[PDB]
């Protein structure tokens, strides 16, 4: 149910010993990607969605509508982390996209058993998670590793600054409230992956994370965008 | 999203022509069904999934998760005509059979675009709702033709008979009134197979179809019953 | 306030020593009775007084009217059971008709404590509740024994299942969830009637047995159905 | 069912003709009376019953209890303004004594008719309610003509009074708002035998007067103090 | 925060050594007074600004509005206790005016600290502020010193009975319940002031003093009146 | 009592005949400095006070104690552009900060009128507005002129950015629903002060520019998260 793809204390085994989940350093590449998209963050705030989440009026048929829509998702973002996996020459990012890819099947087994999903090529997604999720495969697979951190780190953070930011908007006692409860709290894997993308971020181009940072951020708000239209 | 899998009139041509949807009449095999298993669906009422409608307090994950399982059943379903219509003992079941594919083929659309769901094969069906199905399939394909309209009549009439017990508790304001919206009414859907049925009666053992229908119900029961615990 | 008309422990004395309250078996007249009427027992839920039960929105008018007409009825009731009483001359019935008077005596001082009610003849009844209390009398006067038990049956079985049946609509915070709580919970006057019942089965035509229980139970819906028309 | 006792213009025939509702003017006895018991009209305000009815929570037993009550105390009512006319020192008294029992004989149709009683000898009374019933008896029968209008202005003027001054503490949509309706508005009976009493003033012996109003306004306290006592 | 102008235990010195704050006798001027301006009261709770706050409703505007005008009330009464302190012959009076004064230099913190307000001057009183304030003023540095504690009595006494009568009407929960609670309970500095003034009743014109009073208590009213009107 | 500032058309004459109130350009200042504090702005809408707007349940206390604050902070305000125009550099300016004062001048009439301030000698300002409010009169007094457009444009900005983002979490039956209405829509007056600052942009240095705006920008959130802290 807590939604997170951090790894967990057990996993960080061999080269991924030493790696914290601290708040990245403000002089961080993780802070300066985030700051630049803080505009988009907004505008997901000011969705339909979210919007019905703190109400607790959010139509059940646009919640469920995009809890399979993120299976897809997830199921094929675990698979993104296992070909960055494959495609990395460097052995420490190696091992962290093969434990992130642990991280997802093991949230992944919510969509198996509860939402009774069994893969991805058994659903049909909307246009806009394909999207997403074949821009997440494009990085994944052609570009250089350490950019597989920044286009999946929205995903990672995002949700847990948007329940962060509703808590208080969000009455205890509504029907959605387990939202904030599911993903709030501190964002851990978001800041672990923010502390192993520094580590590389001499070995990329800045405007490009940027870039990349900025399309997948534009995605999540084009997700949840879409997401309340049922027409 | 009106939940009906009746025959329309446009669909009424051919031996089907004179196939009528008014209510039964009083001695007919569907109110001896009917009457028959009414303890079961007053328990139907009983379960939590119900009552949590009225409210308008049904965890959204809930309603979502059997939404996904109901896929699951609806595309066996139009395959279980699909086989009733290739095992048909005449003609004019045969294309009863084809046009109740048909209509399941139409109300299917909202799993395949709302919910994203591509087929059967890409859900893990719940244990209740995997044996529901599995028994219809049964029925299709092994007993005759008759015993098809007997199996399937539960999801069609038990559903808005709720919607129409259910209206009068479920306030116009509430979260889950759309259901009531949705699946109440006049179930001319059963009716109409009702009364195809109807004209079989003499070439079926009442006995069987009592079992059969009976069997049914009591997994319509355990299925809703089953959908709240998300354990 | 706790609405029971059953024999206490210290009261079954005599031939009622070994009276039980433990529900009767399956194949007993009293579920026998019981299965045949649901259809009108799902229609006593369908009332708008019960809706406004559930609701907390049945007009407090509607509600006293109806209060004093019970009275009315129960206060005739336990002359029903004294009537019952002397016409017996089964030795173990007539123990347990006065014993029944005795206990409709007991909770009938609710009516002259709480409601103010003196007795029958200082009321007038509805067309309802006064032609459900002759037809009462006229078993009580003029059938055998036995039958006297079957037609008070559905007035003290219907109220518990109805407040059970609700228990899980009608909000622990609501105007009349005193309803739900002084009505509902094991229903052991009615099952220990039926104990008694089931031992005289067989010195009653069962058929006359199922139109009496369908006759009071009948009764108990236009009663219901009346009790909201204050036009 | 407007809670009134005015006689209405069609009866104010013969010695009656000329007989005015205007409010009465401010050096009346109407008002000296009014005026010195409104301390005892402030705390009825404080009872919980009408802190139940501005909140719509009154316990509907509580407002039933007492309206089989006021029940008892109108009817009685009526057998008072009988014995005031029998007793009538005047023509003109007689003819208001008896155009007052008409006026209480079709108001209490709401007695005899929504709550189903019958005469005053088939209820048991309260303490309160019967030592007030009591008290108008005595003064109907034991003391001079116009006494009776003192007795009875209470209950004509407090509850409209009441009414007017919970209008705007009870919402229109909540549960016993239809008790500021069916009371509130302009006092018109009361004003009506405030004119009338005013006729007769230098008849009365002013202290007395105030005595007796002021111990039938004690008992409306007393009784609304109990209604909730349900003990 | 609590609403009080009572002169504390350890202030009650020389000549203030004996003062009680148990209740007024019944024949004391301080009942004679408030009896005759109940109505004025009941005005007061008819109020839509007590209206509001019993309903959790009441403008926000409307309210900060009127503290600003009772922070200039509550500086200029603090004044005018200073000036009848100075004008007073009577040592004891002296004593009690100068022990008032700082009562309201203490209570006017709360205007000060928690409202950023700095004296009167730098207010616009609305008319009937004004009006009141300049009365008090009049009363102070005019008339005979009882006369002080004759005027000021309303705003000591009246808040606290409003607040005592509202409890009740005011839900627990709702936004403006604070208003109770600060200004309810005992109200030991006005029985305080109405054990002074009574020693002194002698030597003051007890119609001149119900004139002061029922002005003062007219005053109220006004300014509650108007206090909603932000037109 | 809308909340603007705006110089209205017909005070746009000689100099400011051309004055335009669209949007900036995407590559103005006024953009540049607004991007660069939104993680301030961000920060604004999580206070406690506009939780409490969009609940409903602000504690009047702390919107009339922030509102007497606002207050002063806008009877400063006006004295500054008044300052900001005897110091101005050229004849463009002194009339646009005359036309500002005056704009001033027409919204503080709120202030004098329902709130009932004279000025701001007669209140004491908190910390954090007493800070922000110094601050304002040293940019006018002792900087360059185009630097007041500067400082003063969060105060214009950030209110109808917040009340815009809060409509859709702000019930419109809600107790505080007016601060959306009176903040909300077209920022016309921030508009309109950013397309005068843009023709000064080569006049002035753009990182001092930066620093005074988020400076003013720290102070809005600073008195915001202080405005509730009634301790």
Redesign the interface.
């Given at each position: 149910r807590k939604r997170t793809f951090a790894i967990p204390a057990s996993r960080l085994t061999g080269r991924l010993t030493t790696l914290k989940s601290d708040v990245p350093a403000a002089d961080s590449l993780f802070w300066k990607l985030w700051?630049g998209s803080?505009?988009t963050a907004?505008q997901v705030?000011?969705t339909?969605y979210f919007?019905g989440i703190?109400?607790?009026?959010?139509?059940?048929?646009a919640?469920?509508?995009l809890?399979?829509?993120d299976g897809?998702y997830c199921f094929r973002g675990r698979d993104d982390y296992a070909t960055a996996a494959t495609c990395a020459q460097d052995e420490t990012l190696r091992e962290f996209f093969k434990a992130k890819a642990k991280s997802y099947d093991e949230y992944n087994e919510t969509y198996?058993?509860?939402?009774?999903?069994?893969?991805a090529?058994?659903?049909?997604?909307?246009t806009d998670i394909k999207d997403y999720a074949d821009y997440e495969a494009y990085v994944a697979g052609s570009l250089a590793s350490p950019y597989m951190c920044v286009v999946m780190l929205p995903c990672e953070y995002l949700w847990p600054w948007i329940a962060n930011?509703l808590d208080?908007?969000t009455?205890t006692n509504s029907?959605?409230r387990?939202w904030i409860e599911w993903n709030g709290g501190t964002p851990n894997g978001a800041y672990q992956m923010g502390n192993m993308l520094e580590q590389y971020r001499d070995k990329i181009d800045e405007d490009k994370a940027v870039e990349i940072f900025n399309t997948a951020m534009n995605y999540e708000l084009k997700v949840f965008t879409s997401s309340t239209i049922?027409t």
């Open positions: 700051n803080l505009d907004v705030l000011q339909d919007k703190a109400a607790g009026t959010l139509d059940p048929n919640y469920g509508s809890m399979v829509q897809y198996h058993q509860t939402w009774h999903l069994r893969e090529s058994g659903l049909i997604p909307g930011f208080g908007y009455p029907l959605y387990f049922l």
